[PDB]
Design a binder for this molecule. Structure first.
Ligand SMILES: NC(=O)c1ccc[n+]([C@@H]2O[C@H](COP(=O)([O-])OP(=O)(O)OC[C@H]3O[C@@H](n4cnc5c(N)ncnc54)[C@H](OP(=O)(O)O)[C@@H]3O)[C@@H](O)[C@H]2O)c1
Ligand SMILES: NC(=O)c1ccc[n+]([C@@H]2O[C@H](COP(=O)([O-])OP(=O)(O)OC[C@H]3O[C@@H](n4cnc5c(N)ncnc54)[C@H](OP(=O)(O)O)[C@@H]3O)[C@@H](O)[C@H]2O)c1
Ligand SMILES: [Mg+2]
Ligand SMILES: [Mg+2]
Ligand SMILES: [Mg+2]
Ligand SMILES: [Mg+2]
Ligand SMILES: [Mg+2]
Ligand SMILES: [Mg+2]
Ligand SMILES: [Mg+2]
Ligand SMILES: [Mg+2]
Ligand SMILES: [Mg+2]
Ligand SMILES: [Mg+2]
Ligand SMILES: [Mg+2]
Ligand SMILES: [Mg+2]
Ligand SMILES: [Mg+2]
Ligand SMILES: [Mg+2]
Ligand SMILES: [Mg+2]
Ligand SMILES: [Mg+2]
Ligand SMILES: [Mg+2]
Ligand SMILES: [Mg+2]
Ligand SMILES: [Mg+2]
Ligand SMILES: [Mg+2]
Ligand SMILES: [Mg+2]
Lengths: 308, 308
């Protein structure tokens, strides 16, 4: 490909101010231009976007500004000869930190204290409530950029770490790596189970009633992956019945999470609005990927994070 | 020194259920007895207590179950020939985790999300709000058990770490160690300033209006030491004026914090009720210290954590 222009779809506004991103790419060597909803594309065009538009199939290359590309019609890009790349590789620090934050919140009871802060109440925990992450077990399901960001911070905090990935291959700081057919073994003894997989045919509904049964009654589920990896109604039922203790949830089967979801109301559920990867430098972090792939295109190298 | 008995002052209940502590000490090899507020003491008596009682001055040895002994008349113990020990050395993991939790809460905006959760509101942060601890600077004031617990976790999360202590001597994971006369130099460029000193003559009112002026306007104060290390009214004024961004506060000039304190109402203040060191295993942690010193007393060895 010969790229002559980078179009910035308005949908990037869902994660970052489009003008900040445009400005980050001012010395890219092609012009970088805001594109509205009904923009048309053609030869020489690269497009950066949150989601898919059929108009993009006229372009040479679409870069999805998310790691997750499950909302893109991948087979159609192949057909059209349009390259598609994603933003995997940039969310390890942000998500890793958020997840460390969730686990420390539960161990140290920070969320209960925040609730009491609204009441101006000096409410002391029950003696058995506060604990330390040091010496506790975490199972990280998915061991890529997100999962490793979680693993490394968990290990540094003194946690025991196991995990699950497709290949079963070793991962630094993970004591035992399981394949997905051994999910129950992986999750059974864990104080925290963290979900960091893409949404695929295989992962959809992976965590359901039987998994909540297997999990320790004192355990918490963390979902920073995609909502439908979990059977959300089963999660509610598990929380109600005490099959698990709680959950930190950044992603949901329907987003925004509807007001009537029971999930909002559990004391030991943390709801976050799909922001575990949020950062005031997202524009720069995505721009780096674009610059990298422009240089790879320019020199005939294989594209980074090429989906199809 | 012949220790014939260990009295467990009822005040230990302020930190842990006394029966759990008593049972933890069943192996001690002297009798272990509960002591009410009017008990009298004599030769061969050891006392485990939260607070001071003049009655203890007839005992041989008092073990304070807290790290902070600022509420004990140390000069009086010396005159009376009563040994005083404290519980420093056991709070590094708990407080270190809590402080990591505070910092991650602020970086990842978890407290704001929790507030929104009460209202079933899917409220996205402002773009500029979320950040990462990785690459940010923390200044830890006090580099003992608490300070090192903080330092080690901050460094492992990728923070730049400087600090302040009395002696100026090197501390692992602290890039620059300042003496207390260089406090302003130490705090000026820090995103987080953590207080982990005892309450002493020198530390009382250490952090006041001029320190808040010096601090970055985007910085947060963390106090896990003692309330009076900070001039609390100056903290309120600094928060109101935007001289600093916020604070995580576990300790206060008056505890419980009065309901009418302005500190409750700042979005970017976390109030916790003197629980940064709370743990369901505190009884075991303190019992270990008692066991160690019982032995050391019996054998004429130097006591652990001897104050006077
Ligand atoms: N804001 C957010 O909440 C946020 C942000 C970024 C990403 N995400 C989500 O997180 C997903 C992962 O992102 P990433 O950048 O970490 O992707 P990545 O680096 O490609 O890693 C994906 C990991 O998932 C593993 N995996 C795939 N199928 C699996 C299965 N059936 N069971 C267990 N593990 C499986 C892969 O295994 P192998 O390594 O063996 O192939 C790999 O370790 C994205 O697709 C997106 O949905 C969410
Ligand atoms: N629940 C809670 O919030 C909680 C729990 C435990 C303790 N605490 C409080 O935290 C305090 C510290 O406990 P710890 O176990 O860490 O004590 P520690 O191990 O004795 O350490 C005290 C540290 O403070 C330093 N220090 C003393 N005066 C100072 C000054 N003027 N400026 C800067 N640094 C100074 C000392 O310096 P040198 O090492 O150079 O002498 C030492 O590094 C306790 O006294 C207590 O008040 C609070
Ligand atoms: Mg409660
Ligand atoms: Mg622990
Ligand atoms: Mg892969
Ligand atoms: Mg392995
Ligand atoms: Mg690695
Ligand atoms: Mg279960
Ligand atoms: Mg089962
Ligand atoms: Mg509600
Ligand atoms: Mg950062
Ligand atoms: Mg010392
Ligand atoms: Mg010296
Ligand atoms: Mg060390
Ligand atoms: Mg070192
Ligand atoms: Mg002074
Ligand atoms: Mg002075
Ligand atoms: Mg001063
Ligand atoms: Mg200032
Ligand atoms: Mg502000
Ligand atoms: Mg209020
Ligand atoms: Mg608010
Ligand atoms: Mg000596």
């Amino acid at each position: 490909m010969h790229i002559e222009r980078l179009a910035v779809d308005e949908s990037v506004g869902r994660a970052m101010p489009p003008q900040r991103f445009i400005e980050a790419l001012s010395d890219l060597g092609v012009p970088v231009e805001f594109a509205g909803e009904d923009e048309q594309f053609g030869p020489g065009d690269a497009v950066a976007s949150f989601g898919h538009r059929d108009a993009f199939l006229d372009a040479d290359w679409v870069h999805c500004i998310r790691a997750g590309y499950d909302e893109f019609p991948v087979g159609v890009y192949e057909e059209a000869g349009t390259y598609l790349t994603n933003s995997t590789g940039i969310h390890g620090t942000t998500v890793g930190e958020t997840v460390a934050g969730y686990m420390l919140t539960f161990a140290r009871r920070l969320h209960a204290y925040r609730d009491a802060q609204h009441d101006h109440a000096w409410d002391l925990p029950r003696y058995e409530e506060p604990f330390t992450l040091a010496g506790e077990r975490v199972c990280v399901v998915g061991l890529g950029t997100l999962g490793r960001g979680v693993v490394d911070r968990a290990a540094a905090l003194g946690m025991e770490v196991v995990g699950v990935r497709r290949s079963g291959d070793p991962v630094d700081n993970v004591s035992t790596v399981y394949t997905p057919d051994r999910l129950h073994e992986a999750i059974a003894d864990a104080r925290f189970v963290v979900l960091a997989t893409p949404l695929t045919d295989e992962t959809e509904g992976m965590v359901a009633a039987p998994e909540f049964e297997t999990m320790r009654e004192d355990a918490s589920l963390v979902n920073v992956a995609r909502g439908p990896v979990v059977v959300e109604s089963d999660l509610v039922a598990a929380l109600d019945s005490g099959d698990i203790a709680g959950a930190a949830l950044d992603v949901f089967s329907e987003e925004p999470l509807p007001e009537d979801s029971p999930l909002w109301d559990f004391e030991d559920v943390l709801i976050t609005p799909h922001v575990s990867a949020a950062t005031s430098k997202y524009h720069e972090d995505v721009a780096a990927l674009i610059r990298e792939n422009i240089e790879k295109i320019a020199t005939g190298d294989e594209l980074t994070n090429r989906v199809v």
